[PDB]
Amino acid sequence: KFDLPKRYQGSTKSVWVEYIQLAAQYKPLNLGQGFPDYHAPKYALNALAAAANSPDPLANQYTRGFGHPRLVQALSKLYSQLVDRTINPMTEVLVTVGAYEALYATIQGHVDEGDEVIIIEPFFDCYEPMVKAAGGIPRFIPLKPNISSADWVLDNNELEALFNEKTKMIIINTPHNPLGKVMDRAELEVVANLCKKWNVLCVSDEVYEHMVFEPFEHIRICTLPGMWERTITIGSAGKTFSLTGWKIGWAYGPEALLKNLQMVHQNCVYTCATPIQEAIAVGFETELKRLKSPECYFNSISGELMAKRDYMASFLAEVGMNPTVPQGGYFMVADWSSLDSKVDLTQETDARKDYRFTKWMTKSVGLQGIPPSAFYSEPNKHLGEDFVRYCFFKKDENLQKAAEILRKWKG
Amino acid sequence: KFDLPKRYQGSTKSVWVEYIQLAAQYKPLNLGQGFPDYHAPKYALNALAAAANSPDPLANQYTRGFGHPRLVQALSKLYSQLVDRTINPMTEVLVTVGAYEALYATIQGHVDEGDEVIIIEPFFDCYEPMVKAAGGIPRFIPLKPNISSADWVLDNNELEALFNEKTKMIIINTPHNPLGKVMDRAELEVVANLCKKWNVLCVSDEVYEHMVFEPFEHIRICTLPGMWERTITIGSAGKTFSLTGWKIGWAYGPEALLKNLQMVHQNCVYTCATPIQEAIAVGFETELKRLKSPECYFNSISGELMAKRDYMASFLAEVGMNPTVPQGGYFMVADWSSLARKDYRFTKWMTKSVGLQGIPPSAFYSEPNKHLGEDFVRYCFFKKDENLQKAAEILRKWK
Ligand SMILES: [Br-]
Ligand SMILES: [Br-]
Ligand SMILES: [Br-]
Ligand SMILES: [Br-]
Ligand SMILES: [Br-]
Ligand SMILES: [Br-]
Ligand SMILES: [Br-]
Ligand SMILES: [Br-]
Ligand SMILES: [Br-]
Ligand SMILES: [Br-]
Ligand SMILES: [Br-]
Ligand SMILES: [Br-]
């Protein structure tokens, strides 16, 4: 009687669980955690401590359900500048439990039974189960390499063909997790034109918006002609400020679209943590004062990461993988398949080769990455099997340890 | 094309979205939503600052999806003592964004299309729209006064009549919001017996578990014979430690039932805030060392609140209302009638004209039964004494 309801049938644990257990068992040099292994900007940490210690007793009591006022004010001040439109802080911004819950409120609020939703593989892992749980029908299309993340592209004919009147939503993720692909203007117009043609909602997951490397540029699809009225754009304080344990994010867009998200949110979590939102608001006000200065965190994070990106691409090419150099973000996918005659995966029991390889590497060599086949639909999982995802948001000494491990191993 | 999906059709802003806005607009003395207007235990606030300031770079990054290990360990340690069983911290506890998301995970996780769910009126208002979003069919029965919250009782015959082959779940809330009713053992046994007869899951919303007044006692339904296997119990750090802005709660119960909640949670928020869970774990470890002490916050909150409860019942009775004196919690319902739906118009009038905000209890009834709440008002008395005095004086002069 108490089995999962239909909309959840065949739910399983995320890939993260077994990889966290694997890391605890073997204690590898861990390049699988998508978060830094050093500390976030001190102004932000100090702001959380100040909110805990606040002399205002209301600092740690309930705040406004759709978002703490100081925070939605700051979010509107920033994004209004970026999108060149004044965004209403009360009706056109919704604060959520991470970008994760902004995706959840968006998909539950706008996907009904039978609605088709286009998802681009490799997908952020929640897109498929959230669409399924809403009674939607996912329609998958993969990015495939033609190297740079710019070389991983969609087949436009395939994409055009997937859209029709039953398409309710497309989810795009730029910069992309985990490729680092930054959609260029032409790629954004491809999506925007199909969305206008078919009257589709575009949900743009832009959590890595501040982490684009020179000479690329983050462009927001909501600014394209006719897109404001049919786009919901999503960001994350965890990704903006490198504080993934804070779990606060947001959706912004027209009030008409945000109403559906508000109905979901108000009877899912109702409201989000007050002192965390206060600290994040302080973080935004700090950056708003120096937005054009190089020490703004929004501007400095890319140069901080680029040296690390380059160092990883170099050591991975040296051991004989072929890395896809990302245009943004802190993940790198590499093709390990030329090492396959140099590794013994015969005692690895998983169905897909990149699980076998990543588990073998943790156990044998003490270096942990993540299997990108986890981010494909079952019929396209073969496209992930030659690859591995690493994170380079790591202390230099740990990147150097990873390099040493691979040097030793090749020797 | 972009209307609400069917499962949300007819949705409107909740009483809380509406009333928080009214409060921001008119800046009344706010005796509405339950929270204290004074500082929570220092040890908890200190622990949050310590987590913000931690030298451990993992303290502010993602933690375990089903709950931060230090917190679920503390929760198992406390609740294993209270329920007289070893609760598995990894499989029988789930941490959530408040008791709100624990209710959400529970209802989504165990209510499928056409399952009937029994809700007891007046109900904490999220129960109904959560059932409806899951495709469930709510069935309602009201508590009615026969004063004390003990005097608000259901008809047992009407309750039994609600149980049938389609009943999947009954939600109980004790101590109760808004009445402060504390279910006694006989009342718990009525529900337990019917759940066992009809193979129904009991969801017990126990956020106010530590706020029972003498001479009453909180009893956990999951301890009744045969009830462990079919109960999910919910709590809240916001209510346990008087830190409502922290929004961390939990469900506990048998592994078989908790699996469903894990799947919904995983695909909803994934994980909850790390430093907040760390601070709450420190708070539980602090209290676990002194469980029978008068200084233990689980023990002291009732004494603190009781004087405030009695002060409010006295001033409400003095102005001509008839209060229901709660057996636990920090809310009081009173019948204002000797002075769209009437109680909405009353609470709104009071906020705007005399600057004193309460809550309309018709928000906690099904549409057909809203008339049962129209003559009442809900006030929160978890406030500094100077502000309870201010309410007394606002009402005295309004009279
Ligand atoms: Br885990
Ligand atoms: Br990991
Ligand atoms: Br700083
Ligand atoms: Br272009
Ligand atoms: Br264009
Ligand atoms: Br750069
Ligand atoms: Br537009
Ligand atoms: Br209120
Ligand atoms: Br996890
Ligand atoms: Br409803
Ligand atoms: Br007492
Ligand atoms: Br049992």
CATH number for the domain that contains residue A23: 3.90.1150.10
- Buried b or exposed e, range B250-271, using 16+ CB within 10 angstroms: bbbbbeebbbbbbbbbbbbbbb
For residue A116, the cross-strand partners are: A137, A167
Q: Where are the alpha helices (DSSP H) in B111-246?
A: 127-133, 156-162, 185-198, 237-240
Tokens representing B299 are 């023990």
Instruction: Tell me how far CA of residue B30 lies from CA of B236, B329, B352, B378, B391, in angstroms.
Output: 22, 17, 12, 12, 10
Same domain, yes or no: A53 and A22: no
Cα torsion A144, A149, A154, A155: sign: negative
Cα A151 to ligand 4 centroid, rounded to whole Å: 13
Same domain, yes or no: A327 and A268: no
Across the interface, of B39, B244, B263, the residue whose CB is closest to A62 is: B244
| Chain-chain contact of B271 with A168 (C-beta, under 8 angstroms) | no
The maximal CA–CA distance of chain B, rounded, in angstroms, is: 61
Rounded to 5°, angle at Cα A400 from A43 and A346: 120
Nearest to B120 by CA among B165, B183, B164: B183
Decide the pairing of beta strands A367-368 and A29-30: parallel
Give the resolution in Å.
1.5
H-helix or E-strand containing B142?
Answer: strand B137-142
Same domain, yes or no: A105 and A250: yes
| Chain-chain contact of A267 with B133 (C-beta, under 8 angstroms) | yes
Is some CB atom of chain B closer than 8 A to the CB atom of A406? no
Nearest to B363 by CA among B376, B349, B381: B376
Instruction: Tell me how far CA of residue A157 lies from CA of A163, A192, A399, B51, in angstroms.
Output: 10, 15, 41, 51
H-helix or E-strand containing B108?
Answer: helix B98-110
CB A390 within 8 A of CB A369: yes
Is some CB atom of chain B closer than 8 A to the CB atom of A45? yes
Cα B216 to ligand 10 centroid, rounded to whole Å: 33
| Chain-chain contact of A65 with B108 (C-beta, under 8 angstroms) | no
CA A225 to chain CA centroid, nearest Å: 25
Which residue range forms the structural domain that includes residue B343? 1-41+294-399
d(CA B309, CA B327) in angstroms, rounded, equals 10
Across the interface, of A52, A97, A267, the residue whose CB is closest to B126 is: A267
Alpha-carbon distance A240 to nearest alpha carbon in chain B (angstroms): 13
d(CA B335, CA B332) in angstroms, rounded, equals 10
Residues sharing a CB contact under 8 Å with residue B199, sequence separation 6 or more, in sequence order: A1, B230
For residue A389, the cross-strand partners are: A333, A370
Rounded (10°) CA dihedral B101, B106, B111, B115? -110
CA B343 to chain CA centroid, nearest Å: 21
Same domain, yes or no: B238 and B160: yes
d(CA B303, CA B307) in angstroms, rounded, equals 7
H-helix or E-strand containing B203?
Answer: strand B201-205
Tokens representing B273 are 């805030």
Q: What DSSP assignment string belongs to B301-318?
A: HHHHHHHHHHHHHHHHHH
Of the three residues B258, B274, B293, the one that is the final residue of a domain is: B293
Same domain, yes or no: B281 and B338: no
Question: In this structure, how many other beta carbons lie within 10 angstroms of the beta carbon of residue A2?
Answer: 16
H-helix or E-strand containing A368?
Answer: strand A367-368
Of the three residues A293, A317, A350, the one that is the final residue of a domain is: A293
Instruction: Tell me how far CA of residue A314 lies from CA of A307, A324, A399, A408, B239, in angstroms.
Output: 11, 11, 11, 15, 53
Alpha-carbon distance B6 to nearest alpha carbon in chain A (angstroms): 7
Residue carrying the six token digits 């789930």: B94
Of the three residues B293, B327, B360, the one that is the final residue of a domain is: B293
Residue type, A293: S
Give how many domains chain A has, as a whole number: 2
* Gap between the terminal Cα atoms of chain B: 53
Across the interface, of B6, B101, B247, the residue whose CB is closest to A273 is: B247
Cα B181 to ligand 9 centroid, rounded to whole Å: 38
Same domain, yes or no: A237 and A321: no
Same domain, yes or no: B9 and B49: no
Residue carrying the six token digits 């165990």: B110
In chain B, what residues touch A199 (CB-CB under 8 Å)? Answer: 1
d(CA A48, CA B275) in angstroms, rounded, equals 9
d(CA A79, CA A220) in angstroms, rounded, equals 10
Residue type, B125: D
H-helix or E-strand containing B23?
Answer: helix B15-26
Same domain, yes or no: B7 and B47: no
H-helix or E-strand containing A240?
Answer: helix A237-241
Instruction: Please report, for the domain that includes residue B159, its CATH number.
Output: 3.40.640.10
d(CA B274, CA B281) in angstroms, rounded, equals 11
d(CA B205, CA B236) in angstroms, rounded, equals 9
Same domain, yes or no: B205 and B265: yes
For residue A252, the cross-strand partners are: A93, A233
Residues sharing a CB contact under 8 Å with residue B205, sequence separation 6 or more, in sequence order: B99, B103, B124, B171, B172, B173, B174, B234
Same domain, yes or no: A153 and A229: yes
Same domain, yes or no: B24 and B79: no
Chain B residue with the nearest C-alpha to that of A64: B20
Is some CB atom of chain B closer than 8 A to the CB atom of A320? no
For residue A235, the cross-strand partners are: A250
Alpha-carbon distance B147 to nearest alpha carbon in chain A (angstroms): 31
- The answer to whether the annotation marks A62 as part of a ligand binding site is yes
Same domain, yes or no: B223 and B354: no
Omega into B323 within 30° of 0, i.e. cis?
no
Decide the pairing of beta strands B152-153 and A331-335: unpaired
